[PDB]
From TrEMBL, chain C:
Highest taxon, organism lineage: Eukaryota
Source species of the chain: Xenopus laevis (African clawed frog)
Gene name in the database record: LOC121398065
Keywords: Acetylation, ADP-ribosylation, Chromosome, DNA-binding, Hydroxylation, Methylation, Nucleosome core, Nucleus, Ubl conjugation
Full-sequence range covered: 61 to 135 of 136
Protein name, entry field: Histone H3
Annotated compartments: Chromosome; Nucleus
From TrEMBL, chain D:
Transmembrane regions: none
Protein name, UniProt field: Histone H3
Domain of life: Eukaryota
Family: Belongs to the histone H3 family.
Keywords (A to Z) from UniProt: Acetylation, ADP-ribosylation, Chromosome, DNA-binding, Hydroxylation, Methylation, Nucleosome core, Nucleus, Ubl conjugation
Localization annotation: Chromosome; Nucleus
Keyword Amino-acid biosynthesis: no
Subunit structure: The nucleosome is a histone octamer containing two molecules each of H2A, H2B, H3 and H4 assembled in one H3-H4 heterotetramer and two H2A-H2B heterodimers. The octamer wraps approximately 147 bp of DNA.
Domain Core Histone H2A/H2B/H3, first and last residues per copy: 6-93
An example molecular function term from Gene Ontology annotations: DNA binding
UniProtKB/TrEMBL annotation, chain E:
GO molecular function, one term: protein heterodimerization activity
Coiled coil: none
Gene Ontology terms: biological process: heterochromatin formation
Highest rank taxon of the organism: Eukaryota
Domain Histone H2A C-terminal span(s) in chain numbering: 77-105
Name recorded for this polypeptide: Histone H2A
Function in brief: Core component of nucleosome. Nucleosomes wrap and compact DNA into chromatin, limiting DNA accessibility to the cellular machineries which require DNA as a template. Histones thereby play a central role in transcription regulation, DNA repair, DNA replication and chromosomal stability. DNA accessibility is regulated via a complex set of post-translational modifications of histones, also called histone code, and nucleosome remodeling.
Range covered out of full length: 16 to 120 of 130
Annotated gene: LOC494591
One Gene Ontology cellular component annotation held by this UniProt entry: nucleosome
Keywords: Acetylation, Chromosome, DNA-binding, Isopeptide bond, Nucleosome core, Nucleus, Phosphoprotein, Ubl conjugation
Organism: Xenopus laevis
UniProt-annotated location(s): Chromosome; Nucleus
Domain Core Histone H2A/H2B/H3 stretches: 1-74
Family, as annotated: Belongs to the histone H2A family.
Length: 95, 79, 75, 98, 105, 72
DNA sequence: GGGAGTAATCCCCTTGGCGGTTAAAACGCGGGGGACAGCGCGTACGTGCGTTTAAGCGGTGCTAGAGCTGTCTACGACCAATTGAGCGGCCTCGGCACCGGGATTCTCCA
DNA sequence: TGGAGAATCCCGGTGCCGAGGCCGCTCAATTGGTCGTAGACAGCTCTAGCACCGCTTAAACGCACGTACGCGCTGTCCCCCGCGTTTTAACCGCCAAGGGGATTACTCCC
């Protein structure tokens, strides 16, 4: 049989990191898999034309942060850029 | 024609789902005409990019692509 | 243009001060702002013209003006 | 015999249909409808059931949206009854038809 | 050993990285950019599943149907801002009645 | 400070005839001022974002082209 | 030097046809309350003219941030080997809706 | 305005099928070294936006004032609405002809 990549296990351990005793059916997992896929190619879209509008052929994270501040409004954007900032600092401070 | 299979109590049920309190009998022909407009638009785009893939069986995936060129895409079908 | 220039640059600068301090503006970009905003507000007034005519009225008021903003859906 | 007043029945209907989520239009008339419509462009077009139900759910989304816009436009027009002139006005102000 | 363990992250960096590479957006890429993008992903999906669990405790259900997700996305003004452009398969509509349509007696 | 009243009401009434509306009530003007202020606050936020990422501190023509073509 | 058309194949997928049946489409009909024509009104709103005021455009300083370049050096592609994260067949027991029927709660007019 | 009547709800009992683990497999992330490279940083240029100001001015503003029609109220009537009745085609499902998307190799082209 063929192989298909899936994100059931990943958001699965995310939700058991957050919600201990809650089950989820197949339809909600499918619509959120399509959601995370859709937000992936769209934000790859803004990353692409911020790269090419700034005459750049290289993706750097600064463009991705800029892309998410250009689309996502409000204080949720500030929380997202904050948690991502701590994520990339604990990435760069790793051994 | 098979548009008479879209019955008027189904239109009543979907209008009560759609939030309409009081319904007259003159909306059905307008609804069917605009249904022709949107549905032949979507199916011409879907069969166009179905035959762009050189296949003859129409699945839901290129349907989701034809919806996401419109800007009101539909989730849960690998999109 | 019929809306006047220098209070439009002044108001755009004043609002941009709430976003980031001390920006400098090219003239042509502000002209692009002016012509685009003129286009959208003209469009919304034939929208309100059709709203008022369909409401069997000749004078518009902000209640009718807002229902059009929920027709487009912005807030 | 007992006969309920109109409007309370509509209130119960709008509550039980905004509570519900099931597809109310039958699948076989819509299936033969899209078969006949697909026969117009090219012959022998074959549909998966997933595409049919996805287009069906999309049709529910657009019709419920335009019904709610119709309702807000009609109560904006100081009426409870709906008329087709509201349909052409709601389709023009949406910008879907120029 | 994996970069997910060293990053303190939980979504796969390599899978989204190879999705970037076969996505042919540009030629060269940074290192922490998919880490940032993945971190934004579990933040946003964690907020969505938190609101889904909130709806689950609201309607006495422990197994989540997308009713929970539609109630979660359509009561928040930010989620109505971001996902008002997008429809939902098996979405449905909230109970909303006008003031005049109420039986004013 | 306080330059929302700079949009004069005869300029709005010229916007009403080129918008084609025959008669205007007095309550229209501050509503339209609020709508244009909301839309301008929306677009200048993107303009500041394009200015900040481009390692510059002024707004140019391609920035406003992108900011106006993003929403359609 | 790897993308692309060409050839069997097959087993899962498409379409449908026929028997039963069953809640639903649609029609019939009294009806009554909201759509809608008609009058009073009064008020806000259109227009018109004195007054002012910011305004339209020129003139100059100027400098400092945009625009272009040298370069080289850290930084990304990429390629041989590995393995454990992460794909799938299988099994099981519990979440949840169905059946049903009494407690609970709108509805109207006498 | 309260009771007859009917919709709703919720709990006792129930069956079912799929959510989630269990184990087998397997192949792209991972290690690490190398080498092309392109943009980070420093540096030279340059030019026009901003600031300030003055001559002259089209337009805004605000009150006076006449009145047109949106709204309130009255009266009408008719048109789908609730209830009852009658056909009806949608759907289970079982089978079945067959069809074709993807799976292998074979060989060609810019």
């Amino acid at each position: 049989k063929t192989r298909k990549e899936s994100y059931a296990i990943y958001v699965y351990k995310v939700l058991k990191q957050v919600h201990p005793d809650t089950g989820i059916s197949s339809k909600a997992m499918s619509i959120m898999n399509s959601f995370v896929n859709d937000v992936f190619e769209r934000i790859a879209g803004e990353a692409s034309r911020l790269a090419h509008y700034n005459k750049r052929s290289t993706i750097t994270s600064r463009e991705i942060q800029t892309a998410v501040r250009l689309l996502l409004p409000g204080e949720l954007a500030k929380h997202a850029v904050s948690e991502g900032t701590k994520a990339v600092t604990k990435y760069t401070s790793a051994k | 024609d098979n548009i008479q299979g879209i019955t008027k109590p189904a239109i009543r049920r979907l209008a009560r789902r759609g939030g309409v309190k009081r319904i007259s009998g003159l909306i059905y022909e307008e609804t069917r005409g605009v249904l022709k407009v949107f549905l032949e638009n979507v199916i011409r785009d879907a069969v166009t990019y179905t035959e762009h893939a050189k296949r003859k069986t129409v699945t839901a995936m290129d349907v989701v692509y034809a919806l996401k060129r419109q800007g009101r895409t539909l989730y849960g079908f690998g999109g | 243009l019929l809306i006047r220039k220098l209070p439009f640059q002044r108001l755009v600068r004043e609002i941009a001060q709430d976003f980031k301090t001390d920006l400098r503006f090219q003239s042509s970009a502000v002209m692009a702002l002016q012509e685009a905003s003129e286009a959208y507000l003209v469009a919304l007034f034939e929208d309100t013209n059709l709203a008022a005519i369909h409401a069997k009225r000749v004078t518009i008021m902000p209640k009718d003006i807002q229902l059009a903003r929920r027709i487009r859906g912005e807030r | 015999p007992h006969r309920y007043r109109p409007g309370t029945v509509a209130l119960r209907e709008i509550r039980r249909y905004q509570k519900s989520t099931e597809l109310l239009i039958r699948k076989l008339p819509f299936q033969r409808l899209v078969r006949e419509i697909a026969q117009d462009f090219k012959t022998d077009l074959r549909f998966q059931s997933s595409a049919v139900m996805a287009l069906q759910e999309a049709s529910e989304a657009y019709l419920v949206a335009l019904f709610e816009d119709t309702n807000l436009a009609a109560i904006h027009a100081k009426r409870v009854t709906i008329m087709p002139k509201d349909i052409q006005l709601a389709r023009r102000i949406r910008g879907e038809r120029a | 050993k994996t970069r997910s363990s060293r990053a303190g992250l939980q979504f796969p960096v390599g899978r989204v990285h190879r999705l970037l590479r076969k996505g042919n957006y540009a030629e060269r890429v940074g290192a922490g950019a998919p880490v940032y993008l993945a971190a934004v992903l579990e933040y946003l999906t964690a907020e969505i599943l938190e609101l889904a669990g909130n709806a689950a405790r609201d309607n006495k259900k422990t197994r989540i149907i997308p009713r929970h997700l539609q109630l979660a996305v359509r009561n928040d003004e930010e989620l109505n801002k971001l996902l008002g452009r997008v429809t939902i398969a098996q979405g449905g509509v909230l109970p909303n009645i006008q003031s005049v349509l109420l039986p004013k007696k």
